[PDB]
Ligand binder design. Sequence first.
Ligand SMILES: [Mg+2]
Ligand SMILES: [Mg+2]
Lengths: 103, 102
Amino acid sequence: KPILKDSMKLFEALGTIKSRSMFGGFGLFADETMFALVVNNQLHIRADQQTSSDFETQGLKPYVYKKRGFPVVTKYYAISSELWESSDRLIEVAKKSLENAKL
Amino acid sequence: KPILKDSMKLFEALGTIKSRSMFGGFGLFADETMFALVVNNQLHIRADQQTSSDFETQGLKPYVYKKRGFPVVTKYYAISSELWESSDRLIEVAKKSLENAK
Ligand SMILES: [Mg+2]
Ligand SMILES: [Mg+2]
């Protein structure tokens, strides 16, 4: 349920967190850079090009936004339930994603 | 519980809705003007100076953000459960608050 608010609150470890409508859900931004997406009541983290290609080769699938039969494959991967139980770990995952998003 | 998400969706008619860390919670902005705040799992609406002054005289208390003994009194008043349960009316209240803020 309160996944959006709980995500934004957790990631304040990265400074001010901003959100706006992105890809059918809500994007999360730090330092003017999107690093996360909350959609289908699930937290997703941004994989850079290299990470996303690898993930796909290894059988993982990113979130896809659809409208009237037009799909948009995103760079956003649903996190595991276990990661949520691991607050500091998840914070580090977001920090690394934000870092890769800025490169 | 997803007050924030629900609120961001509810207020889509007012303008483009964005949120950000504000005053210990999350501020809601319509085309760059803040009109609401989600904190303490409750939606709060912005009262302009006149409204807030009247409210305090009339025994109502705004949300106060506090860190390490430093309190910051805000202009944000918690809505009633009845108003939260009355979607169209809440949109109009937010719309007025936004007008008052501009
Ligand atoms: Mg990239
Ligand atoms: Mg929420």
